[PDB]
Design an enzyme around this catalytic site. Structure first.
Site, mmCIF file in Angstrom:
data_model
loop_
_atom_site.group_PDB
_atom_site.id
_atom_site.type_symbol
_atom_site.label_atom_id
_atom_site.label_comp_id
_atom_site.label_asym_id
_atom_site.label_seq_id
_atom_site.Cartn_x
_atom_site.Cartn_y
_atom_site.Cartn_z
ATOM 1 N N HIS A 14 0.786 -1.213 0.000
ATOM 2 C CA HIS A 14 0.000 0.000 0.000
ATOM 3 C C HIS A 14 0.830 1.282 0.000
ATOM 4 C CE1 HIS A 14 -0.293 -1.570 4.258
ATOM 5 N NE2 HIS A 14 -0.204 -0.320 4.662
ATOM 6 N N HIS A 32 6.395 6.994 5.895
ATOM 7 C CA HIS A 32 5.949 6.526 4.594
ATOM 8 C C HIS A 32 5.299 7.719 3.892
ATOM 9 C CE1 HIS A 32 2.463 6.141 7.204
ATOM 10 N NE2 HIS A 32 1.746 6.433 6.145
ATOM 11 N N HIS A 51 2.345 9.090 0.713
ATOM 12 C CA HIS A 51 1.196 8.937 -0.144
ATOM 13 C C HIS A 51 1.440 9.822 -1.355
ATOM 14 C CE1 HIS A 51 -1.049 6.864 3.055
ATOM 15 N NE2 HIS A 51 -0.348 7.662 3.850
ATOM 16 N N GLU A 80 -2.896 13.462 1.250
ATOM 17 C CA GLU A 80 -4.068 13.034 2.004
ATOM 18 C C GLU A 80 -4.794 14.261 2.567
ATOM 19 O OE1 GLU A 80 -2.990 9.445 4.391
ATOM 20 O OE2 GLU A 80 -4.077 8.590 2.686
ATOM 21 N N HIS A 108 4.367 11.076 6.005
ATOM 22 C CA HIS A 108 3.873 10.798 7.351
ATOM 23 C C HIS A 108 4.999 10.180 8.170
ATOM 24 C CE1 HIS A 108 -0.519 10.643 5.914
ATOM 25 N NE2 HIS A 108 -0.033 11.871 6.011
ATOM 26 N N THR A 122 -4.999 6.506 8.383
ATOM 27 C CA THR A 122 -5.628 6.781 7.098
ATOM 28 C C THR A 122 -5.751 5.535 6.223
ATOM 29 O OG1 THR A 122 -3.633 7.455 5.990
ATOM 30 C CG2 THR A 122 -4.956 9.191 7.113
HETATM 31 ZN ZN LIG Z 1 0.148 7.739 5.893
#
Ligand SMILES: [Zn+2]
Length: 263
Positions: free
Chosen positions: A61, A91, A93, A103, A116, A195
């Site tokens: 992911h 990590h 996004h 996000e 994050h 999230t």
């Molecule tokens: Zn995250």
């Protein structure tokens, strides 16, 4: 299994994870006029001098950089937080294109990516205990704004070719996360959630107002990762972001004055 595609993406997660429609879900849109400046909000204290990175991994992911969290090597304190929170992983996004990927949004603006930095409250003794508690985690969110290349990201970019498919991992030592911080530590904060499933409401979110840069070439290397495992049909790892969720009975607080005409 949950994911980011049309059939299993964020709009479906509530079927197996009903807290997806909870009171304190993340991310949110940060409406900078509505947010409340709180002059009592304390400065953040980012103590990352002794951070010890270990591995980088594609978990299907995102990719995570994992840290040695056995001692107070890299910690976050201050701001809205009580005590000490230990850095365990970071990590990202990101999007399928430079116009989206974050996000959180700021006045409905999407950034190309979001970092994050995930910390757990030493009150609780380890991550797995902390994630079950409302004050268990502190996530420092940092926007990546597409523009000039960022040397602080380059060691990350340069190893991604080693972790293209789900389950792959690689050594990743001596990475300095201080290089991922903007010059200003002014922030917005609110209580929210993980999230991704299981979407637990255990996070004090601290979102920095100043983005860091990233080049198009750098973020394109993120997009060469894949959600799938080796041998499955190729599914590029892009658009691994959850849409913004309603604030409900929360109010975003600002540590600073964003709009001078309001003060
Ligand atoms: Zn995250």
């Amino acid at each position: 299994h949950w994911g980011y595609g049309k059939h299993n993406g964020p709009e479906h997660w509530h079927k197996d994870f009903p807290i997806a429609k909870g009171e304190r879900q993340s991310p949110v849109d940060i409406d900078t006029h509505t947010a409340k400046y709180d002059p009592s909000l304390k400065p953040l204290s980012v103590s990352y001098d002794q951070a010890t990175s270990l591995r980088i991994l594609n978990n299907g992911h995102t990719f995570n950089v994992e840290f040695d969290d056995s001692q107070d090597k890299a910690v976050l304190k201050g701001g809205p937080l009580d005590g000490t929170y230990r850095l365990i992983q970071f990590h990202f996004h990101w999007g399928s294109h430079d116009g989206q990927g974050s996000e959180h949004t700021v006045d409905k603006k999407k950034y190309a990516a979001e970092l994050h930095l995930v910390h757990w409250n030493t009150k609780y003794g380890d991550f797995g205990k902390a994630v079950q508690q409302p004050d268990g985690l502190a996530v420092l969110g940092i926007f990546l704004k597409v523009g000039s290349a960022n040397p602080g990201l380059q060691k990350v970019v340069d190893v991604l070719d080693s972790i293209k498919t789900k389950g792959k991992s690689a050594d990743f030592t001596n990475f300095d996360p201080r290089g991922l911080l903007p010059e200003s530590l002014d922030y917005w904060t609110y209580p929210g959630s993980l999230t991704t499933p299981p979407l637990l409401e255990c996070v004090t979110w601290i979102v920095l107002k100043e983005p860091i840069s990233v080049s198009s070439e750098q973020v394109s290397k993120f997009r060469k990762l894949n959600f799938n495992g080796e041998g499955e049909p190729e599914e590029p790892m892009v658009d691994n972001w959850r849409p913004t969720q309603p604030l409900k009975n929360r109010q975003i607080k600002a540590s600073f004055k964003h709009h001078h005409h309001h003060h």
